Write a protein that binds this ligand. Structure first.
Ligand SMILES: CCCCCCCCCCCCCCCCCC(=O)OC[C@H](COP(=O)([O-])OCC(O)COP(=O)([O-])OC[C@@H](COC(=O)CCCCCCCCCCCCCCCCC)OC(=O)CCCCCCCCCCCCCCCCC)OC(=O)CCCCCCCCCCCCCCCCC
Ligand SMILES: CCCCCCCCCCCCCCCCCC(=O)OC[C@H](COP(=O)([O-])OCC[N+](C)(C)C)OC(=O)CCCCCCCCCCCCCCCCC
Ligand SMILES: CCCCCCCCCCCCCCCCCC(=O)OC[C@H](COP(=O)([O-])OCC[N+](C)(C)C)OC(=O)CCCCCCCCCCCCCCCCC
Ligand SMILES: CCCCCCCCCCCCCCCCCCCC(=O)O[C@H](COC(=O)CCCCCCCCCCCCCC)COP(=O)(O)OCCN
Ligand SMILES: CCCCCCCCCCCCCCCCCCCC(=O)O[C@H](COC(=O)CCCCCCCCCCCCCC)COP(=O)(O)OCCN
Ligand code: HEC
Ligand code: HEM
Ligand code: HEM
Ligand SMILES: CCCCCCCCCCCCO[C@@H]1O[C@H](CO)[C@@H](O[C@H]2O[C@H](CO)[C@@H](O)[C@H](O)[C@H]2O)[C@H](O)[C@H]1O
Ligand SMILES: CCCCCCCCCCCCO[C@@H]1O[C@H](CO)[C@@H](O[C@H]2O[C@H](CO)[C@@H](O)[C@H](O)[C@H]2O)[C@H](O)[C@H]1O
Ligand code: FES
Lengths: 124, 383, 54, 61, 85, 111, 71, 244
């Protein structure tokens, strides 16, 4: 699935009061049990990156965000191989779990999808 | 420049076993690939040796296997090693495939190694089936009869194809001699495909248990994974030793010590344990052709995992719902195995049909739904 | 310890020679030890134990 | 947390006698034993296995 | 998607200092007892439900099916067997 | 009596059916038969039931005289064949195949 | 004489007495039912194999080790 | 399936050879050969066993040569191409009671007594099944059982009706070692002997297995030490990050 799809569907849910009332609490528990924060990751660090679109989005990250992402991946790799969890300031707090990459990938995909549409235009 | 890098032959070995850059956090489930290579080497060594003493003619086959057990120096060991390693080969291949499914090894950019992997699995099944016939005991004959008759279901030409496979009108001498030649060949084909899936993998490298890139943090294959592979090699050899020396016939069927008799049918004809889940799937569909299609589809459906998994994240480490669904899928696969060897009696008939539906619905319904919902929970839950 | 290291370990040629010689010794002694232990735990049962009657 | 000249704490792992010959010799004793059992195991394996090619009992009879 | 040593395909790295000590300088089994007891307990406790729930369910299903099948093929189960076929 | 002749590795069941056996077989309404056939379609001579004694389900050999329709019972998955060797109960789809057989003499048939 | 004879008798009278009585009662029923006329033209003819199996399984559990000890 | 259709499952008897480190009792093997020879061999062959196989297991070279030399075997034709017989040699296989299946079935009311060389591996239960079957003929079949003609009731045999009658009775054999030949004793000895016939490598195999277990376990332990030794720099790695 594309990030665009995921973001649009999520926005439909967040709009509907009923839907948000039942989905948002579930999503928060899901994230707590997921446990990626206990390896010091942010949610966006987990997104598959071996695609042209994602490689382009990663290249457009500001240098500081890019250097920090590299460190979180290396740190999480070291927790994984040691069979340990983060402690203290290495644990990602909910307020630090920012969607740093989502705006870049949504722009890359917007152009990619517009290009696909425009490749199929028919002069009326 | 070091010779290992400069010389083109050495550099090929170097690229796969020495300088090969690996993730630094592979867990012990990344050791099944080297155990599978070990099983393949044991099967080649023991198999070629048994070929030096075995006679493929139906009048002599079963007795040549007794001669191996009784007269050939260490023949009992070579025979039991070959027979038990065939089971260990399937335990390791199920573990390796389960690792691949849990950790999302089938996702881009690893679709090609996974797809060639599905063919390796089919070749292993065929190799093992033909080798089991070579003993020419009761299970050998009757298993060949039942399984080869499934080809009769192919419309129009099925009957003709069966007679062509048998080289006659029933399983007999021509079939045994051709199964010997093909059983000798198929492991070499299987080794080529095993090499192909590794070459295909080498473009992306190994995935890792976190599902993220390892390009940030690589370790040489040697010495780290060489020495970590030795631990599981010795654990494997301990299990091998316990079966081969202390319980060599635990995994077998006693009826295969009775010489093949085309007249008398044994009490129950079942395949070897590792084929049992596919046999249960076949029983679930009442139609002959339906059942054969379902049974083949149960393997070929693995080819669609790259499509039906809609997750933006690779692997299950951080996906609690996917982990539960995977647990149920695996246990259902084991229950199908058990149902493959029960009698066709109530209430196992209906249970086998429900388990078959669950097997297919994992690929077609549940994994696409669960992976869609989890995408949304990750996004909303972390806002 | 330095002496032992210097003679048997420092040169790989010497280390491999020591390992192979030890493997030779181990193989011969282990064979004899297992044979005796096997004979003690299975005493009175083996052909060698009843052979004298015949 | 900031200075890179302050080496992180390795005291939980560091051996005091790390530069001694006794220290190295112990680790090579483990490696050597492992090499020795692997040599003895390979020899046994090869000898028993290849003996299948020598005259079988029915031939010697 | 993977290069080779010297050009692996990492985004640029800067600002990380990494430190480690020789295998000869370290105790390889440091903290083994704590790990073997407390670390294994933590790791197992956190995964236990994902194994227990499916295993226990499928074992229960099997147990019920196998007991019914056994009962149907007794004298007492004659009538229920006749209906089932 | 029912004989078992090996013919191309398959068993051949040859039963020398009595008068009353033939009668028993000619009773069953053709309507209620997975594979609807009457004995006259099966045998070319009412006193010689000649069949390929491989069960039509998977390919085990039915034990004769046993069954529930007192003809042949496949022990493998419990399929019951008749005195015509027609399938009555169990997983088997078809009646036991009839080989191509010709009575050269009245005392010998070729299969 | 055969040690088994004594061991089996002892196990039937002792730890396997409930099963012994079940088998006995079954036999009584079946023999009486066979005695009655138009038994040959009955749909269901009861046997005592099940009860026999329960008894023998029980005797074997209480005897196997004891028997091999005296051979 | 009914329990009767399966057959009653035999008890687990404590055989001497049960036990990772246990051989057969060779005195029992020798006695079991004598039961085979004097009782079973009337109907059952042992075609996979040669006289040489007994030597150094149950008998000396001389005893086994004596057994072989008492029999006549087909020789190569003489110079006019006429058939000849010769005395047996150690290389010869133990000869069976019947020339073919048809003769075997004719002598046993249609039933064919199987060859016993692999019977301990060819039946679930092995020695326990052979012992249970031989000693498990009730005096009377359970009320209600209808045996087919020429069948005998035995609950261990699937379906209950076996074509072999009870053959072991107290004192049918006189053992040469003075052991009381009760039904139970003879069944135990012959079941041991047949287990040996099915798997004559048994004793050697389990001893080689003990050596393998010891070596492989030590190698496993050392491989753990070596892996941990080599991996410690990776496991112990620490980082200081100063964001640029
Ligand atoms: C066959 C041939 C023989 C060769 C043997 C090879 C087997 C080795 C292997 O792959 O498994 C070892 C493997 C240990 O591997 P590891 O590299 O320490 O951890 C891999 C996982 O990340 C470990 O996952 P984790 O860190 O989340 O720890 C969980 C694990 C604890 O893991 C252990 O360390 C054990 O315990 C359990 O999950 C037990 C389930 C609860 C039941 C109650 O054990 C398991 O993971 C078993 C859990 C599977 C369910
Ligand atoms: C039986 C059911 C097993 C389900 C496993 C659920 C996860 C779990 O607890 O496993 C522990 C571990 C969990 O490991 P993990 O990598 O998810 O987590 C490591 C720890 N954290 C989360 C902190 C990073 O799972 C494995 O290692 C799973 C490998 C799957 C192998 C399955 C073989 C079955 C063969 C059938 C073939 C078809
Ligand atoms: C499979 C059979 C393996 C038999 C191994 C024979 C002995 C070689 C050995 O133990 O290697 C140790 C040796 C040395 O291990 P090492 O390389 O750790 O030691 C080098 C440093 N010195 C010499 C100071 C100790 O490894 C080799 O020579 C490689 C051959 C292994 C195969
Ligand atoms: C089976 C038997 C196991 C192999 C034992 C061989 C010798 C073991 C001791 C030798 C040793 O440790 O020396 C290393 C040799 O290891 C090596 O060079 C090999 C390392 C381990 C070999 C196993 C590789 C994976 C095993 C899984 C099988 C793969 C599937 C194929 C069937 C040198 O190496 P160093 O760099 O540590 O030296 C550091 C300085 N010289
Ligand atoms: C092919 C199957 C591979 C698995 C082998 C496992 C055991 C087979 C060995 C045969 C055996 O019974 O050996 C025993 C010792 O086992 C052992 O000690 C052997 C265990 C060793 C495990 C693997 C080590 C290397 C083996 C593979 C290398 C082969 C090629 C390399 C040159 C005792 O037999 P015995 O002691 O009487 O033997 C005479 C020498 N005294
Ligand atoms: C005079 C005949 C006769 C003697 C004596 C005899 N048997 Fe048999 N045995 C048979 C026949 C006939 C069968 C086949 C029964 C059947 O399949 O219904 C048989 C079957 C067996 C079976 C296989 C039953 C099965 O599971 O298929 C074993 C084991 C056996 N015999 C062992 C022995 C041993 C051990 C002895 C004596 C110490 C013995 N027999 C003595 C005639 C004999
Ligand atoms: C992937 C590799 C292989 C697998 C999975 C495999 C599997 C099997 C199996 C299951 C059997 C039946 C074993 C028994 O119960 O006795 C068998 C028998 C046999 N295999 Fe293989 N085999 C493989 C490779 C080979 C090779 C390379 C040869 C070379 C000729 C070979 C030769 C034989 C022979 C001669 C037999 C019959 C003798 C016997 O049963 O032991 N096999 N094989
Ligand atoms: C003869 C059988 C096989 C051998 C010898 C073999 C060997 C290997 C090896 C050595 C690796 C790299 C190390 C590892 O991850 O374990 C590997 C990776 C892989 N294999 Fe196999 N394999 C075999 C069969 C299969 C099968 C049947 C499949 C799939 C159905 C498969 C799919 C894969 C995939 C997808 C990977 C990449 C996994 C990753 O590293 O993320 N293989 N295999
Ligand atoms: C697994 C058993 C060991 C035998 C090796 C397996 C045989 C398969 C090798 C033939 C396939 C060709 O293998 C291919 O070789 C070249 C160099 O050798 C590798 O190339 C890699 O390493 C070399 C240096 O080591 C670099 O020039 C290159 O940038 C890098 O991509 C490819 O990544 C690999 O895919
Ligand atoms: C490149 C490698 C060099 C050439 C390889 C040599 C090939 C053959 C070497 C000897 C093979 C036979 O050598 C022989 O092996 C067997 C074990 O297998 C030994 O036999 C020993 O153990 C076996 C079982 O393990 C017993 O049945 C036997 O009674 C006992 O003596 C002999 O003591 C030895 O003489
Ligand atoms: S094979 Fe004849 S009933 Fe299934």
């Amino acid at each position: 699935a594309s990030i665009t799809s995921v973001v649009k569907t999520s926005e439909l849910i967040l709009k509907s009061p009923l839907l948000s009332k039942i989905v948002v609490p579930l999503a928060k528990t899901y994230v707590k049990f997921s446990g990626y924060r206990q390896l010091g990751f942010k949610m966006n660090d987990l997104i598959i990156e071996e695609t042209p679109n994602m490689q382009l989005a990663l290249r457009r990250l500001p240098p500081t965000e890019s250097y920090d992402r590299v460190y979180r991946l290396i740190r999480a790799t070291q927790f994984s191989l040691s069979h340990k969890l983060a402690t203290g300031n290495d644990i990602t707090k909910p307020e630090e779990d920012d969607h740093y990459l989502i705006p870049y990938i949504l722009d890359v995909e917007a152009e990619a999808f517009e290009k696909d549409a425009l490749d199929n235009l028919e002069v009326v | 420049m070091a010779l290992r890098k400069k010389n083109s032959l050495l550099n090929m070995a170097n690229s796969y076993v020495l300088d090969s850059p690996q993730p630094s956090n592979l867990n012990y489930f990344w050791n099944f690939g080297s155990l599978l290579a070990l099983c393949l080497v044991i099967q080649l060594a023991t198999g070629i040796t048994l070929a030096m003493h075995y006679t493929s003619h139906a009048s002599l086959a079963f007795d040549s296997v007794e001669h191996i057990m009784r007269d050939v120096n260490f023949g009992w060991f070579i025979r039991y090693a070959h027979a038990n390693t065939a089971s260990f080969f399937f335990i390791c291949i199920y573990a390796h495939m389960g690792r691949n499914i849990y950790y999302g090894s089938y996702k881009t950019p690893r679709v090609l190694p996974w797809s060639i992997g599905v063919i390796i699995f089919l070749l292993l099944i065929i190799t093992a089936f033909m080798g089991y016939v070579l003993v020419f005991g009761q299970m050998s004959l009757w298993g060949a009869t039942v399984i080869c008759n499934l080809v009769s279901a192919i419309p129009w030409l099925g009957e003709d194809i069966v007679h062509f496979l048998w080289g006659g009108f029933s399983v007999g001498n021509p079939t045994l001699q051709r199964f010997f030649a093909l059983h000798y060949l198929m492991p070499f084909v299987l080794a080529v495909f095993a090499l192909l899936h590794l070459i295909a993998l080498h473009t992306a490298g190994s995935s890792n248990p976190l599902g993220i890139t390892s390009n940030v943090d690589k370790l040489s294959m040697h010495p780290y994974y060489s020495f970590k592979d030795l631990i599981t090699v010795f654990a494997f050899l301990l299990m091998f030793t316990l079966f081969v020396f202390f319980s060599p016939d635990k995994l077998g069927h006693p009826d295969n010590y009775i010489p093949a008799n085309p007249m008398v049918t044994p009490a129950s004809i079942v395949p070897e344990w590792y084929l049992l889940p596919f046999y249960a799937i076949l029983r679930a569909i009442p139609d002959k052709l339906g059942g054969v299609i379902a049974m083949v589809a149960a393997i070929l459906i693995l080819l669609i995992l790259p499509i039906v998994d809609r997750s933006i994240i690779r692997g299950n480490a951080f996906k609690p719902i996917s982990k539960l669904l995977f647990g149920f899928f695996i246990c259902n696969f084991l229950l199908l195995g058990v149902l493959g060897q029960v009698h066709i009696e109530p209430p196992f008939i209906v249970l086998g049909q429900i388990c078959t539906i669950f097997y297919f619905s994992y690929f077609l319904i549940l994994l696409p739904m669960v992976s869609t919902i989890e995408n949304i929970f990750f996004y909303i839950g972390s806002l | 310890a330095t002496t032992f290291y210097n003679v048997f370990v420092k040169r790989n040629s010497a280390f491999v020679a020591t390992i192979l010689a030890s493997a030779f010794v181990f193989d011969m002694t282990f064979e004899t030890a297992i044979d005796n232990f096997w004979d003690r735990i299975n005493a009175g049962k083996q052909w060698k134990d009843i052979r004298h009657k015949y | 947390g900031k200075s890179t000249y302050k080496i992180p704490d390795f005291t939980p792992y560091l051996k005091k006698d790390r530069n001694t010959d006794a220290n190295r010799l112990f680790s090579y004793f483990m490696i050597g034993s492992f090499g020795m059992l692997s040599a003895a195991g390979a020899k046994a394996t090869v000898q028993d296995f290849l003996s299948n090619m020598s005259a079988s009992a029915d031939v010697l009879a | 998607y993977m290069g080779w040593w010297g050009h692996m395909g990492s985004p640029p790295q800067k600002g990380i200092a990494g430190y480690t000590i020789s295998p000869f300088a370290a105790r390889p089994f440091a903290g083994v007892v704590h790990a073997a007891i407390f670390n294994t307990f933590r790791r197992t406790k956190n995964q236990a439900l994902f194994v227990i729930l499916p295993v226990s369910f499928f074992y229960y299903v099997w147990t019920q099916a196998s007991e019914k099948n056994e009962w149907l093929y007794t004298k007492a189960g004659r009538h229920e067997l006749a209906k089932a076929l | 009596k029912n004989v078992i002749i090996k013919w191309r590795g398959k068993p051949i069941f040859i039963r020398h059916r009595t008068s009353e056996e033939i009668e028993e077989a000619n009773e069953v309404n053709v309507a209620t038969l997975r594979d609807p056939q009457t004995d006259d379609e099966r045998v070319q001579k009412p006193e010689w039931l000649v069949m390929i004694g491989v069960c039509t389900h998977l390919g085990c050999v039915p034990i004769g005289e046993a069954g529930d329709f007192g003809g042949w019972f496949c022990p493998c998955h419990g399929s019951h064949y008749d005195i015509s060797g027609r399938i009555r109960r169990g997983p088997a789809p078809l009646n036991l195949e009839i080989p191509e057989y010709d009575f050269a003499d009245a005392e010998t048939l070729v299969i | 004489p055969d040690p088994a004879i004594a061991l089996h008798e002892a196990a039937a009278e002792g730890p396997c007495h409930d099963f012994k009585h079940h088998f006995d009662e079954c036999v009584e029923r079946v023999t009486k039912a066979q005695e009655a006329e138009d038994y040959d033209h009955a749909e269901y003819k009861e046997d005592c194999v099940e009860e026999f199996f329960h008894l023998q399984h029980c005797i074997n559990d209480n005897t196997a080790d004891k028997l091999f000890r005296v051979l | 399936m009914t329990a009767a259709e399966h057959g009653l499952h035999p008890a687990e008897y404590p055989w001497p050879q049960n036990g990772m480190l246990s051989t057969f009792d060779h005195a029992s093997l020798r006695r079991g050969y004598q039961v085979y020879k004097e009782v079973c061999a009337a109907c059952h062959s042992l075609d996979r066993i040669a006289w040489r196989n007994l030597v150094g297991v149950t008998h000396t070279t001389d005893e086994a040569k004596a057994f072989a030399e008492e029999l006549e075997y087909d020789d190569e034709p003489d110079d006019e191409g006429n058939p000849r017989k010769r005395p047996g040699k150690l290389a010869d296989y133990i000869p069976g009671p019947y020339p073919n299946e048809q003769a075997a079935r004719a002598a046993n009311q249609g039933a064919l007594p199987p060859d016993l060389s692999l019977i301990a591996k060819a039946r679930h239960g092995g020695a326990d099944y052979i012992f249970a079957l031989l000693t498990g003929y009730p005096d009377e079949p359970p009320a209600g059982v209808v045996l087919a003609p020429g069948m005998n009731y035995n609950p261990y045999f699937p379906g209950g009706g076996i074509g072999m009658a009870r053959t072991l009775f107290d004192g049918v054999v006189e053992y040469e070692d003075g052991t009381p030949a009760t039904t139970s004793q003879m069944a135990k000895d012959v079941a041991a002997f047949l287990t040996w016939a099915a798997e004559p490598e048994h004793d050697e195999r389990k001893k080689l297995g003990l050596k393998a277990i010891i070596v492989i376990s030590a190698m496993l332990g050392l491989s753990v030490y070596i892996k941990k030794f080599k991996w410690s720099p990776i496991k112990n790695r620490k980082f200081i990050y100063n964001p640029p």
